[PDB]
Design a protein around this ligand. Structure first.
Ligand SMILES: *SCCNC(=O)CCNC(=O)[C@H](O)C(C)(C)COP(=O)(O)OP(=O)(O)OC[C@H]1O[C@@H](n2cnc3c(N)ncnc32)[C@H](O)[C@@H]1O
Ligand SMILES: *SCCNC(=O)CCNC(=O)[C@H](O)C(C)(C)COP(=O)(O)OP(=O)(O)OC[C@H]1O[C@@H](n2cnc3c(N)ncnc32)[C@H](O)[C@@H]1O
Lengths: 385, 384
C-alpha cells in the first residue's frame, strides 16, 4: 500500500517519463565489508556486484517532496581509505542526482565524517554550477535526536530535569544534540561527556561552554574512553550515543531503568543483547535517535539491486532526519545546508519547523525491532516517577 | 580494436559522466518474432526481457559525431498491428534520446512505413518542445542505394547506360532512389516498375513523371505483382529492391550476369540461395543497398541486453539512414524528412557524401561478404 516494489530500473523509468523527477536525494553506501560475510574480495564486489556505479534504489514520496535514495558503490572502509576516491564517486552520484531533478543532496551515515564533513566535496565542485547543493543534514539529525530524548522520557514516565545524562561521542552529530537539548528541554541535573583520550582538550572546552555559553548549572563530568566506555558512564540514567565505533557500551551493565537514545550506526551497544534483555526483563528503554515520524504517510518505491538481492511492513510514517533535511532546505530557505563542523544556534530553527509541521520522533525502535507499547507501559509502571 | 563490449548500462555510465553525450540517435526494433524463439512467448519477451523500455545498446563514434542506437521494446509485427502503441513507445525513446544528447533521431527499418512515415509521431508530439527532431533518413538511404548501384556496376565491369533496370518496391525508399539515380548516373536503357496491383495508378503516374519531368528517353514497362514478382522482372539486368515483403523475387530465376541491389529487410530474395548460387556459378552480383562506407573506421561501443556478429562487423560501414541523423545535426541544409516528401534535396545528400569521401559499402549481403576474387571472375564472364 505505502511500499511498492519496482522490478524495473528507476533510472530507466525516469528517462522515458514514466516516473516524475525528484526534489532531493540522499547518498548511502553498502555497510561494511567483512571477508567472512561475503563470497568474494572487496574489489570483486565493487567491480562486479556494485559495477562501480551509484545505484538509485528508493523513492520516498513525502508531503514536502520526493527524495531519491542513491547508494554509492563502496563500503564504509573505502570512504576512509582514500578520500580522493570517496569524493570522486560522490561527484558521480551528484551528477546522476542532478539529472533526475535533485536540488539538494544529503550525505548520510559516515560520509561527512570521511569527507571533512562535506568540505572536501564542496572544494572539488567549487568550479561547477550544474550540481545540486550538498548538506550533511546534521542539524536536522540533531533535532530528531532531541525529539527522541523528549519522547523516551515521556514513554519512560520521567522528566529530563531529574536525569543524569551521558553523552557518548561528541563529534558532528553529538555536538549538534547537546546544545540543542539544553535550548529546547529542561536541563538535567548532571551531564557526562564521553569521548576518546585524544579529545580531552576538546571536551574541556565543551565543559567551559556548558557553564558560560549554554547556561548549564548542574554537575559536569568528563569520561575518557579507550577501547570501551569507562565504568562511570553506567552511572547515567539517560545515555545519548553518536559514535563512529560500534559496541563501546555494554548494554548488560546499564542499570535497571536506563533510557538509551543512539544515532550510532552500527549501534554503540549490541542490538541483539539489548533486545534479549528487554524481552526478558523489560528494564531498559532504547531507540534509534535519528528517525522522524511524519504526520502524513510516506509512499516508498523500492528497486532492489538484483546482485545485492525489512522493506515491506516498515513504518510508513518514518523518515531519517538527515535525509529529510534535504527537503527542508528546498522548502524553507532559512534552513541553509550544512558543510563542515557548524557551530551555532541554527539547530533551533530545525527543531522549531519540525514542531510547527507536527513531526515527532519515530516510535521507539531499534533497527528491525519495535518496542511493543505494553512492554513500554510495564517499564513505565516500574521505573517512572 | 574498433568494437568494444561494455557490460554496464550505457545509460548509467552516461548519467555519471563516464560516457560523453551523443549528437544523434537511431531507433530500431528486435527483428521479427516467430516460433524460432523455441522457448519463450512474445509477451514474455516484451514484459520480462525488454521490460517495455527502450534499450540503449550501441554507440557509434564517427568523425562527424556520436550516434546512440536505441532498440524499441517491440517486434516489427507489433508496429503494424498497433500504430498507437508504436507511436507511444517511440515518444518514450525520444525522451531518453533527448536526455543523452541527441538533437535528431532516425527511424530505421519499417518504422516510417508503420507510422505514416513519421507523420503519426509528429502528430502525437503535438506541442511538446522537449523532444529531439525525427527523420526517416530516406534521402540518405536513397543516396546510399545510388552509390551502391554505382559501385556494383564499377566492379561488374558494366555501365548503367546499357542496363535494363527493374525496380521492385516503389515506396518511400524506392521513390527516393529512382529520380536520384536518373540525376546522378547515366540513364539506363530500360526501366521496369514493379509494385503491388493496388498501386497501378500510382505507378502509371511515375511513368508520366519519368518522361515529362525527369527526361528519361528509354523504354518504360509496368509489371504489377499479385504475390510474387511477375516474370517480366527477370528480364532486367540490374534489379533494385525496396519492399516491405520478403521473398517476392526468386533468386534462382534471375538470368546470369544479373546485378541485384537490395535495401529490403528482410531481403526480397532468399539470401541463402543467393550465396549458394554465387559460390557454385559466380553468375550474379548482389549487395545491400543502404550501407555507407566511411573513409575512417568507426569505433563502436556495444552493451548487450543481459537476457538476449558484432565483432565480425566492418568498422567502416554505417547504415545510411542512421548516419542521416548525424548529417542533419552537422549540416543545417539537410533538413529532416517526415512523411512522403519526395523533393530533390536528395542530390544534396549525395553531393555531401561524395564531398566527405563516402562511398557504398563493399559488396556484401547480411553476414556474407562477396570475395573480391569471385567478383573478378564475374567481371570476366559477364563484364566488358
Ligand atoms: S544521516 C544522520 C547520521 N546518522 C546515521 O546515518 C546513522 C548512523 N550512522 C553513522 O554513520 C554514525 O554512527 C554517526 C553519523 C552517528 C557518527 O556521527 P558523526 O558525528 O558524523 O561522526 P564523527 O566522526 O564526527 O564523531 C564520532 C564520535 O564518536 C567518538 N568516538 C569514537 N570512539 C568512541 C568511544 N569508544 N567512546 C566515545 N566516543 C567515541 C569519536 O571520537 C568521535 O568524536
Ligand atoms: S535505414 C533505411 C531504411 N532501410 C532499412 O533499414 C533496411 C531494410 N528495412 C526495411 O524496413 C524495409 O525493407 C524498407 C525500409 C527498405 C522498406 O522501404 P520503405 O519505402 O520505407 O517502405 P514502404 O512501405 O513505403 O514501401 C515498400 C514497398 O514495397 C512494395 N511491395 C510490397 N510487396 C511487394 C511485391 N510483392 N512486389 C513488389 N513490391 C511490393 C509495397 O507496396 C510498398 O510500396
Amino acid at each position: 500500500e505505502y511500499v511498492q516494489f519496482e522490478s524495473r530500473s528507476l533510472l530507466s523509468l525516469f528517462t522515458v517519463g514514466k516516473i516524475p523527477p525528484v526534489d532531493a536525494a540522499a547518498l548511502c553506501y553498502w555497510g561494511e565489508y567483512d571477508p567472512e560475510m561475503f563470497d568474494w574480495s572487496r574489489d570483486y564486489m565493487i567491480e562486479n556486484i556494485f559495477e562501480n556505479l551509484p545505484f538509485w534504489t528508493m523513492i520516498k514520496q513525502t508531503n514536502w517532496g520526493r527524495i531519491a535514495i542513491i547508494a554509492l558503490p563502496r563500503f564504509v572502509s573505502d570512504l576512509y581509505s582514500n578520500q580522493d576516491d570517496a569524493v570522486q564517486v560522490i561527484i558521480e552520484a551528484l551528477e546522476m542526482a542532478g539529472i533526475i531533478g535533485a536540488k539538494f543532496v544529503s550525505l548520510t551515515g559516515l560520509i561527512p565524517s570521511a569527507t571533512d564533513y562535506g568540505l572536501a566535496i564542496t572544494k572539488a565542485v567549487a568550479n561547477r554550477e550544474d550540481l545540486p547543493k550538498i548538506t550533511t543534514g546534521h542539524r536536522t539529525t540533531g533535532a530528531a535526536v532531541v525529539l527522541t530524548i523528549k519522547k523516551i522520557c515521556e514513554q519512560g514516565g520521567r522528566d529530563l530535569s531529574t536525569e543524569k545524562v551521558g553523552f557518548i561521542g561528541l563529534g558532528s552529530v553529538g555536538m549538534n544534540v547537546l546544545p540543542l537539548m539544553l535550548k529546547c528541554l529542561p536541563h538535567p541535573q548532571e551531564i557526562t561527556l564521553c569521548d576518546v583520550y585524544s579529545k580531552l582538550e576538546f571536551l574541556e572546552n565543551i565543559e567551559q561552554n556548558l557553564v558560560h555559553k549554554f547556561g548549564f548549572k548542574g554537575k559536569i563530568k568528563l569520561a575518557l574512553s579507550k577501547t570501551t566506555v569507562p565504568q562511570e558512564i553506567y552511572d547515567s540514567t539517560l545515555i545519548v550515543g553518536a559514535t563512529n565505533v560500534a559496541n563501546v557500551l555494554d548494554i548488560m551493565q546499564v542499570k535497571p531503568g536506563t533510557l538509551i537514545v543512539d544515532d550510532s550506526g552500527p549501534h554503540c551497544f549490541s542490538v541483539e543483547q539489548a533486545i534479549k534483555r528487554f524481552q526478558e526483563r523489560e528494564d531498559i528503554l532504547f531507540s534509534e535517535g535519528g528517525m522522524l515520524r511524519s504526520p502524513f504517510p510516506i509512499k516508498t518505491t523500492v528497486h532492489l539491486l538484483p546482485s545485492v538481492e525489512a522493506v515491506f511492513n516498515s513504518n510508513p510514517f518514518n523518515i531519517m532526519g538527515c535525509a529529510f533535511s534535504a527537503l527542508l532546505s528546498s522548502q524553507f530557505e532559512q534552513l541553509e545546508p550544512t558543510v563542515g563542523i557548524c557551530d551555532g544556534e541554527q539547530s533551533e530553527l530545525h527543531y522549531q519547523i519540525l514542531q510547527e509541521l507536527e513531526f515527532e520522533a519515530g516510535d521507539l525502535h531499534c533497527e528491525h525491532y519495535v518496542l511493543p507499547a505494553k512492554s513500554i507501559a510495564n517499564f513505565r509502571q516500574r521505573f517512572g516517577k
